[PDB]
Amino acid sequence: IRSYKNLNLVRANIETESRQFIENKNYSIQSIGPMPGSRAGLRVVFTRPGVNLATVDIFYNGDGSTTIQYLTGANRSLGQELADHLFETINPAEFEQVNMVLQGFVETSVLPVLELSADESHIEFREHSRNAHTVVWKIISTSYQDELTVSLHITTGKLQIQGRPLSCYRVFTFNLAALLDLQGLEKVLIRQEDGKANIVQQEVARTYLQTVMADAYPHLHVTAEKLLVSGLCVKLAAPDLPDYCMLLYPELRTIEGVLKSKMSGLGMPVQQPAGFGTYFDKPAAHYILKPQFAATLRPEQINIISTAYTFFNVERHSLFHMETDMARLMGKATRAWGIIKDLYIV
Amino acid sequence: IRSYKNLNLVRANIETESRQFIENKNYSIQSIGPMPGSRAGLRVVFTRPGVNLATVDIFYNGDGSTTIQYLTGANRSLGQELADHLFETINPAEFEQVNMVLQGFVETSVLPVLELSADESHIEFREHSRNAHTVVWKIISTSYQDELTVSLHITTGKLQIQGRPLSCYRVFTFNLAALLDLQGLEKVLIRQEDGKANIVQQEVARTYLQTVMADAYPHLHVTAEKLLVSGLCVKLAAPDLPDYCMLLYPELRTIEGVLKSKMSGLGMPVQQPAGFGTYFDKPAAHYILKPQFAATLRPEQINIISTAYTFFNVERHSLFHMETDMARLMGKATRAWGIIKDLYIV
Ligand SMILES: [Cl-]
Ligand SMILES: [Cl-]
């Protein structure tokens, strides 16, 4: 079932979290300290009146891993409670491993997607290594201890992505989705090879798209429409996955296009330093256009733009920061289609 | 590549047809007669002023096929013209071969649809043989030289269909589609094994349907909705084919369902001997209800029923008698969905 070996815990967060756990069930600490003996780690010995002393050993591995042992001592039933508290401070996406190869890349096409991914405030990249066969970049997250290894095999033009599907992976694949064919898109979105989005009848998917987007269908640019039909066939052919929310990437991307090109048609060009922020404020959970810009539009146009940016901003924020059933994804997908529709209808 | 061996030509029609070719190209007959020797057939020697005599030998084989030999004589180029004329008197579907096995059938499940298919004017069936392990039926057509072999292995309950995707195949599989699961439905509709309809995400297809059926989606019968989503997932996963027209089966039967039970609720139950022939007439090229029945209903109800039955009737007539681009198939699919939701909304 559940295994506590080689966890990816934040080391600086262990002790604090353990202490507050103990104080939330009003248990009492017998001792918390460095682990005796060769191995580095933490020993937490706590109890509650009525049962024996629970001992939990927290070993520090050499690769930054952590292992929790609760089956020692005289109260394993109690120590497992602390073990589970520590285990549930980890994002599930931390128990996964990504190791993909995309075809047809060279350095002048890959560098831009890295620089766009480093235009977020919590993402940094740097050139890790290079010879004449491969060039390796690493993408680090400043808030979470998360690094993604992006290696470009020059002579084969093959791009390798290694690590865990966390915030660097998500930002990078989001900015990289603009360039990919159907199979590459399906690879980055479902994290599996041998996916079968390529067998979906593209003309039946296209009739799906005309049905849900009606009058906007002639105004879509084929950038937008071929990424929407490609998203449709990634969704229709998706396997069973614990989280489907990366499948929302194709729609968000086209929202980011259409909004960013509607607003510039109304005297609101989007720049690189400030971007969307210069044009919106945020009372409660809403984004609303600032009054100086809202006084130039009409009341129907102000809300199409505001709810569009709210949707785009908060679902990209929750995808990029790991929140910070295919039915939920389809609900958000059809909301998105309605949004892209309304933006073309106004 | 093109090969003129083992064609299935209507033998009694060969001679006249060749004669008419000769009279349409103003060619002149040197001889038309039975082929000399044991093997029966026809020898056609014709010419036009300016070239040599073309000889075309048309052998009748033991399996009812016919073979055309045009490389005899002194004019291969001219005789091939007649060979090609005869060759294009054959339906492309007659060069195809179907040999499939469907699972989970019993004798009381097959006899009804096999007998239902023999209530057509050009279809009759008979029990060909039976022992204690399997029982074989044949379905022969009265107009075309076409027989379909339907063998049910009792002990394993497997039903296998052998022959050509012609008139009998279409009638039988049409009556059989209401009973099938997704994989069997796709088997009979695309006449290929190893299809990939089962990988279509049933929830995205179901949202497609929920979108196209507007208010009718909550009152659709669960029978109807399951047949419509199975049709949607066979179309989305359809391989690449010369004719897509059997993909219309799931909707046609569903209309026949909804129609036959919405007229069941307003005092017009449909029987087996007559059917819908004692309700609507045959004016021009449409199907209007008879005045005795139209005078009891409302003005939209008379036309919902006549246009619905007209669509059903003429698309079934064109599919059963081989009247003849996924775009065209989708075009009729949208018209079918509009009809079914109009019958639920009226
Ligand atoms: Cl690829
Ligand atoms: Cl089957």
Curated annotation (Swiss-Prot), chains A, B:
Inducers of expression: Repressed by IscR. rnlA-rnlB forms an operon, the downstream rnlB also has its own promoter.
Biological process, per Gene Ontology: defense response to virus; mRNA catabolic process; regulation of DNA-templated transcription; regulation of growth; single-species biofilm formation
UniProt subcellular location: Cytoplasm
Record InterPro entries: RnlA/LsoA-toxin_DBD (IPR043994), RnlA_toxin_N (IPR045837), RnlA_toxin_NRD (IPR031845)
One Gene Ontology molecular-function label: RNA endonuclease activity
Loss of function: phenotype: Not essential, slightly smaller colonies on minimal agar plates at 30 degrees Celsius. Strongly reduces RNase LS activity, restores growth of an enterobacteria phage T4 dmd mutant. Altered mRNA half-life for some cellular transcripts, including an increased half-life for an internal fragment of 23S rRNA. Allele rnlA2 is due to a premature stop codon at residue 33. Sensitive to high concentrations of NaCl, sensitivity is eliminated in a crp or cyaA deletion mutant. Increased levels of Crp and thus increased levels of cAMP.
GO cellular component: a single term: cytoplasm
Key words, A-Z: Antiviral defense, Cytoplasm, Endonuclease, Hydrolase, Nuclease, Toxin-antitoxin system
Main location as per UniProt: cytoplasm
Entries under Pfam families matching the protein: RnlA-toxin_DBD (PF19034), RnlA_toxin (PF15935), RnlA_toxin_N (PF19417)
Enzyme Commission code: 3.1.-.-
CDD domains per the UniProt record, alphabetical: RNLA_N_1, RNLA_N_2
Protein function: Toxic component of a type II toxin-antitoxin (TA) system. A stable (half-life 27.6 minutes) endoribonuclease that in the absence of cognate antitoxin RnlB causes generalized RNA degradation. Degrades late enterobacteria phage T4 mRNAs, protecting the host against T4 reproduction. Activity is inhibited by cognate antitoxin RnlB and by enterobacteria phage T4 protein Dmd. Targets cyaA mRNA.
Assembly, per entry: Forms homodimer in solution. Forms a complex with cognate antitoxin RnlB and with enterobacteria phage T4 antitoxin Dmd.
Record remark: domains: Composed of 3 domains, the NTD (N-terminal domain, residues 1-90), NRD (N-repeated domain, residues 91-197) and DBD (Dmd-binding domain, residues 198-357). The DBD is responsible for dimerization, growth inhibition upon overexpression and recognition of T4 antitoxin Dmd (via residues 327-357) and antitoxin RnlB and subcellular location.
Listed name of the protein: mRNA endoribonuclease toxin LS
Native species: Escherichia coli (strain K12)
